[PDB]
Design an enzyme around this catalytic site. Structure first.
Site, PDB file in Angstrom:
ATOM      1  N   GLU A 356     -15.744   0.002 -18.412  1.00  0.00           N
ATOM      2  CA  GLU A 356     -14.590   0.875 -18.234  1.00  0.00           C
ATOM      3  C   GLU A 356     -14.039   1.343 -19.576  1.00  0.00           C
ATOM      4  O   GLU A 356     -13.642   2.507 -19.722  1.00  0.00           O
ATOM      5  CB  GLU A 356     -13.518   0.159 -17.412  1.00  0.00           C
ATOM      6  CG  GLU A 356     -13.871  -0.034 -15.930  1.00  0.00           C
ATOM      7  CD  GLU A 356     -14.246   1.265 -15.222  1.00  0.00           C
ATOM      8  OE1 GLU A 356     -13.594   2.294 -15.486  1.00  0.00           O
ATOM      9  OE2 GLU A 356     -15.183   1.256 -14.389  1.00  0.00           O
ATOM     10  N   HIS A 486     -21.377   8.493   1.228  1.00  0.00           N
ATOM     11  CA  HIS A 486     -21.520   9.721   0.456  1.00  0.00           C
ATOM     12  C   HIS A 486     -21.903  10.904   1.338  1.00  0.00           C
ATOM     13  O   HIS A 486     -21.443  12.030   1.104  1.00  0.00           O
ATOM     14  CB  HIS A 486     -22.558   9.509  -0.643  1.00  0.00           C
ATOM     15  CG  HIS A 486     -22.204   8.410  -1.593  1.00  0.00           C
ATOM     16  ND1 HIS A 486     -22.181   7.086  -1.214  1.00  0.00           N
ATOM     17  CD2 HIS A 486     -21.866   8.433  -2.903  1.00  0.00           C
ATOM     18  CE1 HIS A 486     -21.837   6.339  -2.248  1.00  0.00           C
ATOM     19  NE2 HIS A 486     -21.642   7.132  -3.286  1.00  0.00           N
TER      20      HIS A 486
END
Ligand SMILES: *[C@@H]1O[C@H](CO)[C@@H](O[C@@H]2O[C@H](CO)[C@@H](O[C@@H]3O[C@H](CO)[C@@H](O)[C@H](O)[C@@H]3O)[C@H](O)[C@H]2NC(C)=O)[C@H](O)[C@H]1NC(C)=O
Ligand SMILES: *[C@@H]1O[C@H](CO)[C@@H](O)[C@H](O)[C@H]1NC(C)=O
Lengths: 596, 192
Positions: A356, A486
């Protein structure tokens, strides 16, 4: 007089208005994701609504500005990106119908439920069913859950997906694309760049060429995993056939990670888990992120702004509120960079902090760009930059050097081959899955698959491309594609395939500039200033330059190459080749668990 | 004594496009204290070190106070270009004063945004030195007249800085006082 100047002035207005508006929106999104209350949902909604209305305004401003007369490439790119108008091309009625269908499908997926014959309790994906598919070794509850998902939920989505393909095919043909698949492939489009161009169909051709170069490694991974699963389920698996789709670690066989327990090559060698030593040395979240900062800075990367350390949530708030704990890296704008993470003192969260903060590094590098170009070069660059950090940080060399491992700590090839096999189960395992999912969607949009062969093709392509057979016959009443987050919610998928290949081109390139000896996996990039400089010469670009040029800035290559992926996995490749010396490699596509 | 306390310690500063000017006359000024305050991230004098201008007399002094982003503080100097330098506050090529500047994040930034301070984003031409333009006429960018309204090729010439207590150092508010010193045939009433 070229209105280029008028478009310059317009973009100068847009940058500065959108800066404040998107800062408002990102801050309200933060405050919901850090407080999560009904007031905060309302404030976040109102901020995003003002922001989205500002876009419906400014995209339609920009439509006028004709891109043809913009010879300052940057300007043309800002205008092009803002002029991606999508659903606004459709009739208001059909915009509303398509939004209706998308909301229906997304809520069906997020709220669907199937019922045990066992307990008559009705589970769901994220709670019950995923724990079944990830932690269950019973052949029959995995089949129950797999099939019940694809039946109770997949059947409801089927006509929704038909009308969805219909409306978004219109929406694509309105923006001068050939179909919705071409619309999505329009991400990698590069135009007006001598020697750096990239058509929307060369994505087709490169993906196919490189998947062909992937095929042997996947075939031997598949043979090996089939062998071990046949040892763990003999009466259910063929030694030559495909893998039963419900026995692949999660609800879809997207990642084979949850198979490691059954497929670990050396079942008794120690796995590297430094979580015990971090707890032994009184590390906290602040220490983890400080060490990640130190990693990046060792590589000539800047420190985290103090506003980052002041504004990020790095611990479970546990004060006066609750938080969506999905680790996210925020670039709210105006130099404000933050990280959400409900961090534990674990090696998993340690590597996740590096990942991150690598997203953060990418954000901070291109902050000097004009907002519209503040993004990864294409859709897969950001996560690849994130992944190479976890690669460099999970290595013994690094773990020793930070003192989280013994200075005498070595690592035995068994250990190394175990690590490579796990990496392949997650990384290589998702490549054919993803390639074939997106190839099927692309052909459906192109029309190359009649509605009445929709699934009949899918599973053929499950048998042919991924070597995976369905355990039960499926008729067009199903829509087992849409059974994935998705597909039900309208996201391009090829980003994972491209991201996988990019991350290894990157990690190989930076390990070369690092002067790294030996096999490519253990390479640390720490202290390799030169590697960080080579990386920054791409990061600071954002999307101000073509992604072929951004890639060349790191790897010296203008396009997508699996040779770094294959070089990363060559030891495990040479391992599978000699394991399988008494096994069948590949798959016949006619074996099914249900011929009985 | 010279009223520098009301230029520097003013409760609120003006927006950079309406930069405030205070005339300083008939008083004794101690500039060594303004520098040895050590509270200014910028105190760069293009006339003479703050040493001799305590030992010097001028006819009039001009304290021009305003606010601009830290990244933009590099533009408050002779010979620079940018939005602020072209369209807000211009220093001449032969500028003989000082530029003082400090970070006002604790005063001019507030949660939710402080939209008090503006700056001029578009203008037909660049400013002369020490010029001030405070018109709110909509900037016509194309060839259709705007009719005094924002729209297609028609934008308000003024936009609002968003000073948050979480911005990066360069998007944070900075208070700037530019000191100008002049000499005429009138006697010098500003000394130290
Ligand atoms: C590459 O960067 C890393 C950043 O972590 C350096 O790690 C550590 O760097 C220090 C300073 O050069 C080395 O000196 C050691 O300091 C510790 C402090 O507790 C001391 O106990 C040792 O006796 C030694 O003096 C330290 O060796 C090193 N860590 C390890 C595990 O070796 C690293 O030095 C850099 N590489 C270089 C400078 O070649
Ligand atoms: C979160 O929202 C509540 C309102 O329910 C508010 O009282 C509080 O100040 C907010 N911020 C926090 C808890 O940090």
């Amino acid at each position: 007089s070229t209105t280029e100047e008028q478009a310059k002035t317009f973009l100068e207005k847009f940058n500065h208005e959108a800066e404040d508006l998107s800062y408002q929106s990102s801050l309200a999104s933060w405050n919901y994701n850090t407080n999560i209350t009904d007031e905060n949902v309302q404030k976040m909604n109102e901020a995003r609504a003002k922001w989205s209305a500002f876009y419906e305004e400014q995209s339609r401003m920009a439509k006028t500005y004709s891109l043809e007369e913009i010879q300052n490439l940057t300007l043309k790119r800002q205008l092009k990106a803002l002029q991606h108008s999508g659903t606004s091309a459709l009739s208001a009625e059909k915009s509303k119908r398509l939004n209706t269908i998308l909301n229906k499908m997304s809520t069906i997926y997020s709220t669907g439920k199937v019922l045990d014959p066992n307990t008559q309790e009705c589970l769901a994906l994220e709670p019950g069913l995923d724990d079944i598919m990830e932690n269950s070794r019973d052949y029959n509850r995995r089949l129950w859950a797999w099939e019940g998902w694809r039946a109770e939920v997949g059947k409801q989505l089927r006509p929704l997906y038909e009308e969805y393909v219909v409306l978004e095919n219109e929406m694509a043909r309105a923006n001068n694309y050939e179909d919705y698949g071409d619309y999505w492939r329009g991400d990698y489009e590069v135009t007006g760049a001598g020697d750096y161009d990239y058509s929307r169909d060369q994505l087709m051709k490169d993906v196919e060429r490189t998947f062909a170069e992937i095929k042997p490694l996947y075939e031997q991974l598949h043979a090996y995993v089939r062998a071990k699963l046949m040892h763990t389920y003999p009466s259910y698996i063929s030694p030559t056939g495909c893998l039963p789709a419900h026995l692949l670690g999660d609800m879809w066989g997207r990642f084979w990670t949850n198979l490691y327990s059954l497929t670990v090559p050396f079942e008794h060698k120690p796995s590297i888990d430094v979580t015990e030593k971090m707890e032994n040395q009184s590390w906290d979240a602040e220490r983890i992120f400080k060490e990640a900062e130190k990693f990046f800075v060792s590589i000539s990367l800047p420190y985290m702004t103090q506003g980052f350390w002041d504004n990020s949530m790095l611990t479970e708030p546990g004060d006066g509120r609750k938080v969506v704990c999905h680790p996210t890296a925020w670039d709210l704008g105006k130099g404000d960079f933050r990280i959400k993470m409900c961090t534990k003192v674990t090696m998993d969260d340690f590597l996740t902090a590096h990942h991150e903060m690598g997203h953060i590094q990418y954000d901070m590098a291109y902050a000097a760009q004009p907002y519209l170009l503040r993004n990864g070069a294409n859709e897969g660059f950001h996560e690849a930059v994130g992944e190479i950090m976890s690669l460099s940080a999970a290595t013994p060399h690094y773990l020793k050097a930070l003192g989280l491992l013994a200075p005498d700590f070595h690592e035995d090839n068994e250990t190394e081959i175990n690590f490579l096999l796990k990496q392949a189960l997650t990384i290589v395992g998702t490549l054919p899955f993803t390639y074939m999912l997106e190839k099927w969607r692309w052909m459906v949009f192109k029309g190359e698959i009649p509605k009445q062969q929709w699934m009949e093709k899918w599973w053929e392509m499950k048998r042919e491309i991924v070597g995976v057979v369905e355990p039960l016959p499926h008729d067009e009443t199903y829509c087992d594609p849409a059974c994935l987050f998705h597909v039900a919610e309208d996201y391009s998928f090829i980003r994972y395939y491209t991201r996988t290949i990019y991350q290894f081109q990157f990690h190989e390139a930076l390990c070369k500039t690092a002067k790294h000896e030996g096999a490519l996996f253990k390479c640390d990039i720490s202290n390799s200033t030169e590697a960080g400089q080579r990386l920054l010469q791409m990061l600071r670009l954002g999307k101000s330059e073509p992604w072929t040029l951004a890639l060349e800035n790191i790897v010296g290559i203008k396009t997508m190459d699996v040779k770094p992926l294959l070089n990363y996995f060559e030891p495990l490749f040479t391992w599978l080749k000699e394991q399988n010396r008494n096994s069948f490699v590949g798959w016949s596509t006619e074996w099914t668990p249900y011929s009985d | 004594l010279c009223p520098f306390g009301e230029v520097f310690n003013a409760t609120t500063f003006a927006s950079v496009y309406a930069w405030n000017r205070k005339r300083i006359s008939n008083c004794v000024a101690d500039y060594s204290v303004l520098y040895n305050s050590t509270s200014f991230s910028t105190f760069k004098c293009y006339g003479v070190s703050p040493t001799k201008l305590n030992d010097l007399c001028f006819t009039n002094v001009y304290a021009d106070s305003f606010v601009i982003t830290g990244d933009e503080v590099r533009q408050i100097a002779p010979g620079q270009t940018g939005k602020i330098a072209d369209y807000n506050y211009k220093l001449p090529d032969d500028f003989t004063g000082c530029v003082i500047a400090w970070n006002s994040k604790h005063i001019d930034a507030k949660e939710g945004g402080n939209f008090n301070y503006l700056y001029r984003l578009f203008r037909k031409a660049n400013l002369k030195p020490f010029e001030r333009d405070i018109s709110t006429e909509i900037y016509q960018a194309g060839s259709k007249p705007c009719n005094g309204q924002t729209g297609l090729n028609c934008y308000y010439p003024l936009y609002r800085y968003g000073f948050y207590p979480t911005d990066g150092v360069g998007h944070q508010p900075y208070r700037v006082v530019v000191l100008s010193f002049e000499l005429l045939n009138a006697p010098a009433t500003v000394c130290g």
